[PDB]
Design a protein around this ligand. Sequence first.
Ligand code: HEM
Length: 154
Amino acid sequence: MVLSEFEWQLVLHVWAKVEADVAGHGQDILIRLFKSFPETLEKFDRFKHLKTEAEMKASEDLKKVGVTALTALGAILKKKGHHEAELKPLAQSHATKHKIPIKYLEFISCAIIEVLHSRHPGNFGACAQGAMNKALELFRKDIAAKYKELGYQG
Ligand code: HEM
């Protein structure tokens, strides 16, 4: 799959809004991940006492985890698919160390799109949601290929 320039521009336009409050987006995305797909919380044992949205919102640690992921993803999206160098260390750590299945990357991709729609409904319409869906699908396809090159199914 290959995105058009129009699709990349829709993705990068909404990402500038993410960056304007990266902490709030990162919190909301991880909270949605943990609440809508509760199985993912097991990958973060240190968050085991955070049982509700408001408890999660108090955690600077959880916020930092979200900002770390959004920062890496933003750098990837700005490469407009020429992101092999950025995916190398991410596949290494997520396949071999954190053991994150590709399905969980699908979940967080979905959570990203839904949080962006919740926070920016007037500027993140159906076309922009579809462009972000394509960009994140490309990310997952390419990282899954790297998982397989490390010997993991994902
Ligand atoms: C857009 C998708 C994601 C991106 C860009 C991303 C990015 C990152 C980055 C940059 C780090 C720190 C460096 C590293 O260890 O490679 C990290 C750490 C980590 N990530 Fe991911 N991540 C993503 C999805 C996920 C998901 C879905 C999970 C679990 C359900 C996960 C679990 C972890 C864990 C356990 C760590 C170790 C650090 C910590 O415990 O806070 N990641 N991630």
